């Protein structure tokens, strides 16, 4: 009728289906069924699929900071023994 | 597990960072003698209250807390009739 | 074609029983030594309407014999029983309207 198929019913678009999803930070956490559409946060796995190489590539390893493995890199060349220090002057 | 570093729990040197110098921070002191200071977001009412009777000898009728949009907390403190809140402007500045 | 209306009933999404205001399942007293070898009399305190069914229910209080206490049993009321009457259940219960007897 007046809240018709298009513009009229577009005025009823208040209240959201998804929210922030603390695991991903994307506005894709379904609120009623409490599960992220992007990664399925409550489940332990990450919810990737091989039919989306774009989706795989935009959240693969290395797209973030790599706080630990970046430091762990360039260590196998040194082969330093843990606890060792350079010789003092 | 043994932690070797000293604790990172925030003492007042880290809870309370600075006071305000806003016109609102001064006008209520001028009129009805209520004071304004600023502190860290992780502090609580009595963590802040500990500063006022820890660094200073001024009675605290109450401490009031507020969470600003900039990521800090604004604290308000009061006094009682025993102490005037006028020299609490001259000494502090 | 598509799944028909009668076929969608077994899924039980919107075809589950509207039972929000039901007062409880109407069950006889569980078989006990007292009921197996004689009368045990419970007092029908109240007669309620169960919204789902058309037959009124009887709230019968039985004093438990294994402990101190009373027990509430919801029994479909026969026509003629009234609040405050004593209802005998068991092998040696007299044959009267409302009593629970072995067949």
């Amino acid at each position: 009728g007046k809240a018709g198929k298009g513009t009229g019913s577009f005025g009823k678009r208040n209240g959201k289906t998804h929210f922030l999803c603390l695991r991903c930070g994307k506005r894709s956490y379904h609120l009623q069924k409490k599960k992220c559409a992007s990664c399925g946060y409550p489940s332990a796995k990450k919810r990737r699929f091989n039919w989306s190489v774009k989706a795989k590539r935009r959240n693969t390893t290395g797209t973030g900071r790599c706080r630990y493995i970046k430091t762990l890199r360039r260590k196998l060349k040194n082969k330093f023994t843990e606890g060792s220090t350079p010789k003092p002057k | 597990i043994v932690k070797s570093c000293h604790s990172k729990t925030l003492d007042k040197y880290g809870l309370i960072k600075y006071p305000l110098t806003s016109e609102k921070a001064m006008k209520k002191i001028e009129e009805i003698n209520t004071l304004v200071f600023m502190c860290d977001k992780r502090a609580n009412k009595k963590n802040i209250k500990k500063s006022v009777k820890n660094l200073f000898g001024i009675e605290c009728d109450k401490v009031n807390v507020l969470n600003t949009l900039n990521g800090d907390k604004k604290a308000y403190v009061r006094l009682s009739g025993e102490h005037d809140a006028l020299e609490v402007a001259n000494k502090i500045g | 074609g598509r799944v028909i209306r009668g076929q969608r009933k077994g899924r039980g999404s919107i075809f589950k029983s509207h039972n929000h205001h039901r007062k409880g399942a109407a069950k006889l007293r569980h078989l006990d030594y007292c009921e197996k070898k004689g009368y045990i009399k419970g007092l029908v305190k109240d007669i309620i309407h169960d919204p789902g069914r058309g037959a009124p229910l009887a709230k019968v209080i039985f004093k438990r014999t294994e402990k101190y206490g009373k027990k509430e049993e919801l029994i479909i009321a026969s026509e003629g029983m009234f609040t405050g009457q004593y209802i005998s259940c068991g092998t040696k219960a007299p044959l009267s309207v409302g009593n629970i007897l072995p067949i």
Binding site: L72, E82 | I1, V2, K3, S4, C5, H6, Y13, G14, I16, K17, Y18, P19, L20, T21, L55, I92, G93 | -
Partner: protein, 119 residues
């Protein structure tokens, strides 16, 4: 402007006293900073790096003061054991990997592989 070795060894209680009061002095700067003045602003970087310099030694200092209590003893805490990768930690030790049963041990030990030369 304090430096490394002038506070590398000084008494811990005096360290704590000066550290406690210098932050109050920092907030005293902050009074004027929130006020119309900003004339003392550039030294806070130096003070902040002196704090880290004193503290990279003070955390190490509490580190010796606490580790000399628990040195060695085979039952090191979680942090004190070696921090190799998980695979390396769970790997068989070289002794266990080269462990050799008595049969083939008496085989090779008595009858080794050894060099020669063909003319």
């Amino acid at each position: 402007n304090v430096k490394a070795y002038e506070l590398r060894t000084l008494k811990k209680k005096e360290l704590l006293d000066k550290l406690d009061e210098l932050k109050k002095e920092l907030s005293g700067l902050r009074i004027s900073k929130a006020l119309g003045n900003s004339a003392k602003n550039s030294k806070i970087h130096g003070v902040r790096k002196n704090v880290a310099r004193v503290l990279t030694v003070y955390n190490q200092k509490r580190k010796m003061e606490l580790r000399q209590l628990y040195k060695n003893k085979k039952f090191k805490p979680y942090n004190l054991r070696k921090k190799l990768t998980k695979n390396k930690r769970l790997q068989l030790s070289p002794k266990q990997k080269a462990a050799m049963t008595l049969r083939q041990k008496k085989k090779v030990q008595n009858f080794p592989q050894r060099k020669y030369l063909v003319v």
